[PDB]
């Protein structure tokens, strides 16, 4: 959450990264809320 | 009843702010919550570590 908000406050256009099944909900929720694009090699989330 | 100081010394500020140093006394509160053993609607209430 700290890292994501750092990248966001920095004002980057898109974010590439990795997520654990523990941290995935946080990432998807934040990217979904602030309308910031996230790109990942990690396992596909179950959902839309 | 333990007489331990309760009120925090100062405002912690932003939670996201890094590095974030947690207020020590919080630990005590955790302890104070865990050692509680009381009776209620759910039956006997007691906690582990």
Distance, CA of B13 to CA of A27 (rounded, Å): 24
Distance, CA of B9 to CA of B46 (rounded, Å): 30
Check if the beta carbon of residue A28 is closer than 8 Å to that of residue A45: yes
Q: What is the resolution of this structure in A?
A: 3.3
Chain A residues with beta carbon closer than 8 angstroms to that of B18: 2
Chain A residues with beta carbon closer than 8 angstroms to that of B19: none
Q: Which two tokens stand for residue A25?
A: 């909900």
Distance, CA of A48 to CA of B24 (rounded, Å): 42
Task: Give the number of other Cβ atoms within 10 Å of residue A24's Cβ.
Answer: 15
């Amino acid at each position: 959450t700290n890292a994501f908000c750092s990248q966001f406050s920095r004002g980057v256009y898109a974010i590439f990264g990795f997520y654990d099944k523990k941290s995935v909900n946080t990432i998807t929720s934040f990217c979904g809320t602030l309308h910031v694009s996230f790109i990942t090699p990690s396992f596909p989330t179950d959902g839309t | 009843k333990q007489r331990i100081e309760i009120s925090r010394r100062g405002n912690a500020g932003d939670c996201l702010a890094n590095p974030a140093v947690p207020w020590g006394q919080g630990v005590e509160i955790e302890r104070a919550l865990k050692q509680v053993q009381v009776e209620g609607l759910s039956g006997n209430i007691k906690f582990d570590q």
